[PDB]
A = this chain, B = another copy of it.
Amino acid sequence: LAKELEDVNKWGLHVFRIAELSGNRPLTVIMHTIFQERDLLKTFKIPVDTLITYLMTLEDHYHADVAYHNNIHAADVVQSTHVLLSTPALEAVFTDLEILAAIFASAIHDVDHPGVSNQFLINTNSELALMYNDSSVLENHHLAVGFKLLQEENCDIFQNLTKKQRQSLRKMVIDIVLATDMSKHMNLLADLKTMVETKKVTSSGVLLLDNYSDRIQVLQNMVHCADLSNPTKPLQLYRQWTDRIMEEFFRQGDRERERGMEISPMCDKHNASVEKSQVGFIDYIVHPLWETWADLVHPDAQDILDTLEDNREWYQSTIPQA
């Protein structure tokens, strides 16, 4: 396990092995490792036992019976964000508090996920959709639950931050997790594209982000990229993620069919095209986003983009075409 954690600063860490080796505690192990690596416990005077207590409770609140949106996905997004934070184009740009916010946001961003979509929750008149007025239903809930867990016994990892730091961190984390709602994707992308075209860099080629709006925008898209990073990973990892999302989707589709509902796109196990669906996912969502991130940090993300394009060509390879 210690050997596998040597790759914690590398894209494509084998998170599934981490999960197996840690007794299904990938989120706790990876968060702890990253907090030590970034010296965050010292910087913010976080008691190690408080950190571990919070992380284990947090991890407990990801559902074991949800195939994709579980603690392994959370650990993956945390670790991917951790790698992106260290991209050369962003060297010394973000404060320790901003870094803490991005990583914490990643860790909680899907907590207590039920394995069905916002639209399903809206369409089925769920209590969650009633609570949140059909608006970013799950993302609001992830935030509420993630913060609420800080209240459990010896779980307040932010106990030694100043009031101002707490308030700032809370705002940033909320802004980041709400940006993981796919209903915001096109607007986020449109604005990121415009940021890229007017971007400013130092002599060494480091990005200049002069206000909160530009800074939080980059953190939002960073964690969104991490959330949408599966197709950019080594193929053996990507195939496992594809298996899991389809299992989750098909279970939702089964519930829709039981309820006499129209079956959502890609949720029908009898009429599904896995390869077609991943190529569409890459072409219409993942590549447009990642090519824009790559533009922002050029050339830092070229290897990531190369893998994505290779994986796209792979998934397309068994689909007959004119």
Chosen A-B contacts, 10 in total, with CB atoms closer than 8 Å, are: A130-B144, A130-B147, A131-B131, A132-B132, A132-B140, A132-B144, A133-B144, A133-B174, A133-B178, A135-B174
Using a CB–CB distance below 8 Å, which chain A residues touch chain B?
Answer: 130-135, 140, 143-144, 147-148, 170-171, 174, 178
Chain B residues with CB under 8 Å of A148's CB are 130
Chain B residues with CB under 8 Å of A144's CB are 130-133
**Cα distance A132–B137 when bound, in Å?**
10
Closest to A123 in B: B167
Shortest distance between the CB of A30 and any CB in chain B (Å):
25
Closest to A170 in B: B134
Shortest distance between the CB of A218 and any CB in chain B (Å):
21
Shortest beta-carbon contacts, A-B, top 9: A133-B174, A133-B143, A131-B144, A133-B140, A130-B144, A130-B147, A130-B148, A134-B174, A133-B144
**Cα distance A143–B135 when bound, in Å?**
12
Chain A interface secondary structure, helix, strand, loop or mixed? helix
Chain B residues with CB under 8 Å of A134's CB are 170-171, 174
Shortest distance between the CB of A110 and any CB in chain B (Å):
15
Shortest distance between the CB of A96 and any CB in chain B (Å):
23
Closest to A131 in B: B144
Shortest distance between the CB of A289 and any CB in chain B (Å):
24
Chain B residues with CB under 8 Å of A132's CB are 132, 140, 144
Shortest distance between the CB of A194 and any CB in chain B (Å):
20
Closest to A127 in B: B148
Chain B residues with CB under 8 Å of A143's CB are 133
**Cα distance A135–B133 when bound, in Å?**
12
**Cα distance A130–B140 when bound, in Å?**
10
**Cα distance A143–B130 when bound, in Å?**
8
Given A133-B140, A133-B178, 15 new contacts (CB under 8 A)? A130-B144, A130-B147, A130-B148, A131-B131, A131-B144, A132-B132, A132-B140, A132-B144, A133-B143, A133-B144, A133-B174, A134-B170, A134-B171, A134-B174, A135-B174
